[PDB]
Amino acid sequence: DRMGANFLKVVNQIKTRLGANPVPLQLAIGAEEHFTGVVDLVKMKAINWNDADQGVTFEYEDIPADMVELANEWHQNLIESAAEASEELMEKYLGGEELTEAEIKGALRQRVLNNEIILVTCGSAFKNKGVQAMLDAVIDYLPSPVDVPAINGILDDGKDTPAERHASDDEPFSALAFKIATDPFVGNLTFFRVYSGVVNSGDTVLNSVKAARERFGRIVQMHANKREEIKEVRAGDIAAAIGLKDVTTGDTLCDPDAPIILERMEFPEPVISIAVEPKTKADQEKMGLALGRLAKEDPSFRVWTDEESNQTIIAGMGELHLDIIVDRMKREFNVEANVGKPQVAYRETIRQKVTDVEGKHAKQSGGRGQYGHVVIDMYPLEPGSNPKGYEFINDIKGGVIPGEYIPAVDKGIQEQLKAGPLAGYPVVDMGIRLHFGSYHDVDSSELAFKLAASIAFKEGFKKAKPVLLEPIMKVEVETPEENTGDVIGDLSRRRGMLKGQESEVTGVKIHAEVPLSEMFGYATQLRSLTKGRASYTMEFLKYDEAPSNVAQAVIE
Amino acid sequence: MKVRASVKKLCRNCKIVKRDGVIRVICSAEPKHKQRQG
């Protein structure tokens, strides 16, 4: 009931883009605003709908006079669709035996077990135009659990013997576990569907793929919202297999001494990774355990937790989900989150090299004025193979500072090497040479040279432009059309180190090397480049840098 | 139409015609290159 809504265009657009074979049945009457009839073509009857009511009439009439010929040229393509479905209707399309409403569906229903044609219907949901029409095809074009191939439990490891079991009540019990939601009443819940067999209330239902024992509690059905306790679950209902101790994605819900499934196909990868941070330090005690009931619900929600910084780095496949699981924490889990950046190796390096920085120390701490005017020379970040991140080349002029006071200057430099003048970014792996160490007697101690060395190191960084040693990820992107030229140009805004442009039968896969420091909102940006039309991989390879030049003014 | 005292022929294909007396300069594809005063 919208402008530009041509029914015959879209069904005949599938034969061009999707490449399928749709033969539609319920056509259109009305110029989309005075629309009143939906043209079912098997029975050749138009249906009247409600003046504006939420559901009164179903009045069937004949084909109206304003579409007496388009019904003619389209019904003859309907009755084609059984002569090339079954071989037996081939000789009565041409011989001229009558192609009734009941005879043609007996061939076309068997054309849904192979799925070469889909059955299309135009109408309105909101204007109550078509919804009462759409239900009768479901019992005649959508398959039943007893008309399909039923539960097929193979074996375990012995031999590949796929066994079609019965769809009736006369089999060992069988179900599957999916849509396993949560609740603050019982904890874990499920939305499971039983394919055949009957269970009573109270059972030792196992999960036979992961070797765990569970007991079957009080099962509850819904109107999608309201608790209705379903005691006796019949073959084919959908309910809540409650009280499972541990349960994974798609394992069996089955009594022992019975057939057994072991099947988990297409385990996904949540791609976009944002790092959640608590508000109070009482929150991390309850945000460390947030992974418990949340990640148990679904495999499209991962947490790539770090090894050092101990922040909680989540992983989603869409930020649109990483919206929601924060909002799931908000009013019911009662969490105040401060969503920030993931743990990228931010090891401050150095662009410029300071010549000499003297730590100014002068204080009568221990009686006499403990001096300590020691000077260090900013040495280039030690490269190649350097296991120790602290490379203090203590160059005492003529071994002047004694061994007792060597730890002093060492400690000061080490303290600021692990710290960072930007946001506490470790200036590690940076070799540092001592220029000259002033030494005394009553004016020589630990603080004497420790405090001095501390300031000296920081002073140097202000005139050494510390940049950022950064990890580089192997980023691949799969995009079908010639819209990747805007992508790889916009990828060139982000130091994506290009490898090559390659193609597939439908996709143009681009190969690049992107800084992990330059991830930020990568997912939401390509999703506005690719329009969300992208399915690709993420790996790691090199390690490079990302521009900072913050020592100039930003760094105090 | 941006206004400034200087009409400088800036774009490579920049027409200049004196409509009403005040000069306004006519590009083809760039709307940014069109001034009006001077």
Partner: protein, 176 residues
Amino acid sequence: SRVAKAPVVVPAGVDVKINGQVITIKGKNGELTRTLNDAVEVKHADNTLTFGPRDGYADGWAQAGTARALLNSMVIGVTEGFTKKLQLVGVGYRAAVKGNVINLSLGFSHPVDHQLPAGITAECPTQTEIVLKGADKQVIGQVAADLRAYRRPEPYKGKGVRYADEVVRTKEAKKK
């Protein structure tokens, strides 16, 4: 000049009515008259029309340089005509001709149906293509440009009403 080296040849089938300054051209399907300025010296000499700038109005080389281009278009417009097709690229936008009226499916809360004057035989082969036919070169643009000014070419999608030969410059979002 170039215009002085440009005389116009009237053919058989279009009659001129030279009452000096006022010329009313009796043509094929209309009457294309222009009451020119007094900076012209007109003479349908033998068959090919010759003109002239009057003294005093020595800037009439311009004022009749309009006229030399003018009447050439008039004798070929009253007979052959102008095809002025417009391309409607709009989401749910249609075009349909009835009598001398054009509909405008233009994304509004109310329909716009404007009546179009004489010198117009409009047509519509489809909802996005619309013919206009006419005799004056002015009137075949003036009624066309009014529609285009109701929905100018949008340079972020290519949305709008646009001419057949006109080629827009659509940009990209580049931020979000």
